[PDB]
Design a protein around this ligand. Structure first.
Ligand code: 3PE
Ligand code: 3PE
Ligand code: 3PE
Ligand code: 3PE
Ligand code: 3PE
Ligand code: 3PE
Ligand code: CLR
Ligand code: CLR
Ligand code: CLR
Ligand code: CLR
Ligand code: CLR
Ligand code: CLR
Ligand code: CLR
Ligand code: CLR
Ligand code: ACD
Ligand code: ACD
Ligand code: PLM
Ligand code: PLM
Lengths: 401, 401
């Protein structure tokens, strides 16, 4: 736990200050300099994924700080290099720099500094820069960390061909809580495929003001698939883990849990298409979707509250509705975590459903763009206690001990 | 040389980022959203003193960093408490925060967020907040440092009543290089007394576009006195030190060096009024002012090069035109310091002259606003080398050794 250099602290402070001032400027520009004749929704949907990634990186930095200060040995659990581990300052710095890029791109999109440069390339430029940062072969910007992330992501995406370590499962679950990022990426690529109107200078902000685009409606069904990939990877990873251990509890339980949200997305897309054609069984399929929503959300909430966190232990004794031993300084943190998780499981499931072409009016987009940051926050608070429990008592039989 | 807390470095980074983004926004606002029908010169003259104070604080933080790393024991020389001295991080922090305040005030002056609140009260708020932070009796914001600065300010301004320590001489010389700050403060008082037209909402920016105000002209002569006051303090401090030590070399020589500038500004202002009323002795008094220009500037340049820095030492040996022993890593730094002092020791006297209504065209204000930061930079370099020389060879007979 070597302290970070003062230069890194200065850099993260600089990035945070630039980010907060740029965000205040963004809010002021949105309040003052914006056109209501053109639909700002494509811009919001495109930049929502980037904003969620920035929030996830910042919350992960907070997670690393809390882990290293509480006592949980995250570097041992993640199997990272003890000497080359990344401090929370580095994660904060990366989040700040990427937020700088995101805010600059959004400001450029709001009012184009250059008339020649179209406003529809700024999101493309920002995401291309992000992906280049992720793939950059030159060993300048966190080359060890970036290469480890690239290798682990490649391993995760090839779920059934490698043994599921803790880190692979961890990032797969993070993606399970970051389905909005991939879904917005799919929306962006299809939108670029069809509805930019390259001739238009403000093509990314259509002047129709009424949402009737082919990509806005998810009747094609690709939205459902790209929403199930985060669950698909976890499902097959847990199946491979079961094949490795030949132990049903909890591997088949996890497979069932992820199939609940698989059927969630499939049913939501199907009955949304059914409603779009006004067929009589729309109400029956909506009922099947509501009961599947309830069972899936309850399943994930109970598992997160019982096995992932480890709470509600019978051997707790003094600790009410908790474990026998705790690492974090206050039990009120644990309690508020339980209520937060309870509400945000419902929030996560309803966000999945509503973005799965359920609520066509603009209120659906508002509430989804509101709930996605809440989903990332819930994943961060879940990560806290998941890592703490993993250190305390080995769950999921990852380590030999 | 104790390292600063990590949160202090984070704070200086945050302030640096906020300041750089606010400065970029200020430049953009000046380029795009600015009215040319109204004279912006009063605004520039009011905010120039604050900007120069920010620059002086930042360069003083650089001063402290260079002193600590080079080896010169500045805390012993300044007679500060060894266990409570301020690192360069604290100076950077306060410079950044005051720059944040200045940039916010300037931006709000550019476009008033509130129509009810007049645009001319913003400089009042900024400078009142600065002075309140300077007089703040509550022991929250650098109470030890602020109280020591207040006590030493009181000692310096009442020069002939206490012994001249190194710190008193040091700050008096700083003020001698910061005459523009007091000049602009006096301009603020006179402007606020006469040329606001309180009824006008934008009274801080008159719509005349032709500057003929009573304050813009300096026929009254109070500008001359507020230009002499720092040199007045230095001259009387040197006389008091001579009375204490009864030694002519260099106390009377220093008195002459700090006294030539009184006649400098006298001749400048008197010739300005003489040309304004257009008598015949204007050319004769201009010749007198130029010869006194030359002699005063040469006096200051040679003393800075010979006794303050200690350069051109006969016992130098290998070091060409330098001291025998040098602390700073490179002699090229010394040489570039000599060149910079030679160049800017000529222009700073011009800076005194122009603000004595010697160049009534707008070019005078442009060149003054450009040269005052250069004067502060010259004083920063002089502080570097004066402290370095003082540590090596006791100059001015301050310490007993
Ligand atoms: C509307 C306008 C926009 C508003 C939102 C603007 C968001 C800006 C970006 C988020 C804020 C980033 C800045 C805060 C995190 C960085 C803090 C930091 O570096 O603190 C230094 C601190 C001291 O170091 P130490 O713990 O001694 O040693 C560390 C060993 N490497 O070391 C540490 O890092 C440890 C202690 C701090 C870490 C825990 C707390 C960090 C987060 C606190 C909340 C920050 C604000 C969150 C956003 C609120 C609004 C949405
Ligand atoms: C170095 C690290 C830190 C960087 C910090 C950068 C901070 C930038 C903050 C910008 C804040 C804007 C402040 C605006 C002040 C008021 C200006 C105003 O009211 O006018 C808007 C101005 C003129 O436009 P308009 O109104 O059409 O003209 C009217 C004619 N009188 O409109 C303008 O053209 C002025 C504003 C232009 C701002 C454009 C910034 C875009 C970002 C630059 C990069 C673009 C590409 C980024 C892609 C990244 C991909 C990796
Ligand atoms: C398409 C869907 C995408 C979904 C999100 C995927 C990425 C999520 C963010 C990264 C995942 C977190 C990684 C683990 C964090 C917690 C553990 C930790 O702190 O690990 C430390 C690790 C240092 O590893 P180290 O010790 O150097 O490796 C062995 C050295 N021989 O260092 C790390 O923490 C590794 C982190 C890598 C560097 C930070 C991330 C770089 C920026 C990513 C940009 C992604 C662009 C996305 C574009 C599409 C957006 C719509
Ligand atoms: C166009 C729009 C306007 C753009 C410009 C706006 C204004 C920009 C403001 C400039 C930035 C202010 C502060 C920058 C330096 C701060 C560095 C810092 O605090 O880093 C901490 C660093 C590490 O600490 P360490 O030396 O290990 O030990 C310290 C012992 N207590 O400790 C140190 O401090 C030591 C290392 C740095 C100290 C020497 C260098 C300081 C100054 C660097 C140049 C700053 C920019 C100058 C102007 C550039 C443009 C002309
Ligand atoms: C705390 C740390 C963080 C600080 C962050 C800094 C925040 C301020 C950053 C300013 C950035 C400006 C960005 C401008 C974006 C584009 C806006 C634009 O083009 O319009 C200007 C807008 C409306 O004005 P106008 O154009 O006349 O209206 C047209 C009607 N449709 O005009 C506006 O009203 C928008 C711009 C308002 C900026 C006002 C800032 C004033 C500062 C607040 C305090 C004021 C008092 C300070 C006193 C200090 C004393 C110590
Ligand atoms: C009207 C004309 C004004 C002209 C300028 C006057 C101010 C000049 C700038 C401050 C002077 C610097 C003082 C010495 C700096 C170099 C030496 C150094 O670093 O000293 C460290 C010293 C530590 O002090 P400490 O240890 O507390 O003292 C012993 C404890 N018994 O701590 C310090 O460095 C003390 C510094 C004090 C705090 C910084 C300054 C506070 C802000 C001042 C605002 C002024 C407002 C002006 C308004 C008018 C503008 C037009
Ligand atoms: C990334 C940091 C430096 C902030 C970005 C600021 C720079 C890159 C931006 C801000 C305002 C921009 C200018 C705004 C307007 C015009 C007019 C036209 O002729 C196109 C270019 C030009 C001249 C832009 C050039 C780039 C510019 C100067
Ligand atoms: C959503 C509802 C309607 C159906 C699915 C929920 C039921 C059947 C399942 C889902 C998760 C399950 C829990 C998962 C893990 C454990 C830990 C084990 O040591 C005791 C049983 C216990 C506590 C299980 C009890 C039954 C359980 C709650
Ligand atoms: C319903 C909601 C708002 C309940 C509150 C949830 C949030 C605010 C709570 C839940 C868990 C909490 C965290 C639990 C553990 C840690 C690590 C510790 O070293 C510092 C506090 C910190 C970082 C807590 C911060 C606040 C926190 C994130
Ligand atoms: C110091 C930091 C927080 C930056 C300052 C930002 C805040 C305080 C400023 C920036 C822009 C400002 C707004 C600009 C314009 C108006 C319109 C009018 O009805 C007066 C108030 C109101 C609504 C202002 C309220 C305060 C405001 C929101
Ligand atoms: C306008 C400019 C030239 C300033 C005029 C005053 C100058 C020339 C005068 C004023 C006081 C004078 C000093 C008074 C006393 C002595 C002591 C003597 O043993 C050596 C010369 C020395 C040190 C003088 C040098 C010249 C001096 C500094
Ligand atoms: C701070 C003081 C004691 C420094 C010593 C120099 C004094 C005596 C000098 C310096 C500059 C001089 C002023 C320069 C110009 C003018 C304008 C003229 O129309 C009347 C005289 C008057 C007002 C002078 C009075 C005397 C003066 C103030
Ligand atoms: C151009 C004229 C009018 C002003 C400057 C020249 C004359 C008067 C004086 C003013 C201050 C003087 C210097 C003051 C101190 C020293 C150090 C001493 O050990 C050798 C002489 C030396 C280096 C002097 C040389 C001559 C000098 C520069
Ligand atoms: C030719 C002229 C105009 C150039 C201007 C001179 C400037 C750039 C020079 C003069 C003195 C120099 C400083 C002298 C000593 C130090 C201390 C060292 O530890 C870091 C560099 C630092 C802080 C130097 C930075 C550059 C510097 C400020
Ligand atoms: C922790 C919670 C995080 C929440 C962050 C919030 C982000 C922004 C929120 C909502 C987006 C705002 C939308 C308002 C715009 C509506 C379009 C109307 C005009 C049109 O239809 O043309
Ligand atoms: C280290 C160097 C620092 C330099 C700092 C200087 C920055 C810019 C300088 C001066 C400001 C320029 C203003 C241009 C025009 C002003 C008034 C024109 C309108 C009128 O006449 O009504
Ligand atoms: C956008 C202008 C910023 C101006 C200030 C620059 C701040 C970053 C300086 C980085 C210098 C590189 C040294 C890295 C050393 C290290 O990380 O150990
Ligand atoms: C304008 C919003 C800023 C948000 C971030 C706040 C940054 C400063 C937080 C200061 C916390 C207290 C640190 C104390 C450490 C010390 O005593 O040096």
């Amino acid at each position: 736990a070597q302290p970070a250099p003062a230069w890194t602290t200065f850099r993260v402070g600089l990035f945070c200050g630039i980010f907060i001032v740029l965000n205040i400027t963004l809010v002021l520009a949105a309040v003052f300099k914006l056109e209501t004749d053109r639909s700002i929704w494509p811009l919001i949907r495109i930049y929502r994924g980037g904003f969620l990634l920035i929030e996830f990186l910042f919350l992960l930095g907070i997670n690393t700080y809390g882990w290293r200060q509480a006592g949980v040995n995250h570097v041992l659990i993640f199997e990272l290099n003890p000497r080359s581990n990344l401090s929370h300052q580095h994660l904060f710095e990366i989040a700040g720099f990427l937020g700088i890029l995101w805010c600059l791109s959004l400001l450029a999109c709001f009012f184009a500094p250059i008339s020649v440069i179209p406003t529809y390339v700024y999101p493309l430029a920002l995401y291309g820069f992000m992906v280049f940062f992720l793939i950059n072969p030159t060993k300048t910007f966190y080359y060890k960390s970036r290469f480890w992330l690239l290798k682990l992501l490649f391993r995760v995406f090839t779920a059934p061909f490698h043994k599921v370590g803790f880190a692979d499962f961890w990032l797969a679950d993070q993606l399970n809580s970051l389905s909005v990022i991939l879904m917005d990426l799919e929306y962006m690529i299809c939108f670029y495929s069809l509805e930019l109107k390259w001739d238009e200078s403000k093509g990314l902000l259509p002047n129709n003001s009424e949402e009737s685009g082919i990509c806005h409606k998810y009747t094609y069904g690709v939205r459902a698939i790209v929403q199930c990939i985060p669950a698909w990877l976890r499902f097959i990873q847990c199946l491979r883990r079961y094949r490795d251990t030949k132990r049903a509890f909890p591997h088949l339980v996890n497979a069932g849990k992820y199939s609940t949200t698989f059927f969630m997305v499939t049913f939501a897309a199907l009955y949304s298409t059914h409603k779009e054609r006004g067929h009589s069984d729309t109400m029956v399929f909506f009922y099947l979707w509501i009961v599947f929503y309830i069972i899936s959300s309850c399943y994930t909430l109970i598992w997160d509250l019982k096995m992932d966190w480890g709470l509600f232990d019978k051997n707790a004794g003094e600790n009410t509705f908790l474990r026998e031993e705790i690492v974090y300084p206050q039990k009120a943190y644990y309690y508020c975590a339980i209520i937060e998780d309870v509400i945000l499981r419902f929030a996560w499931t309803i966000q999945i459903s509503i973005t799965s072409t359920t609520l066509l009016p603009h209120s659906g987009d508002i509430i989804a763009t509101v709930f996605a940051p809440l989903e990332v926050f819930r994943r961060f608070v879940w990560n806290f206690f998941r890592l703490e429990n993993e250190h305390l008592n080995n769950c999921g039989e990852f380590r030999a001990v």
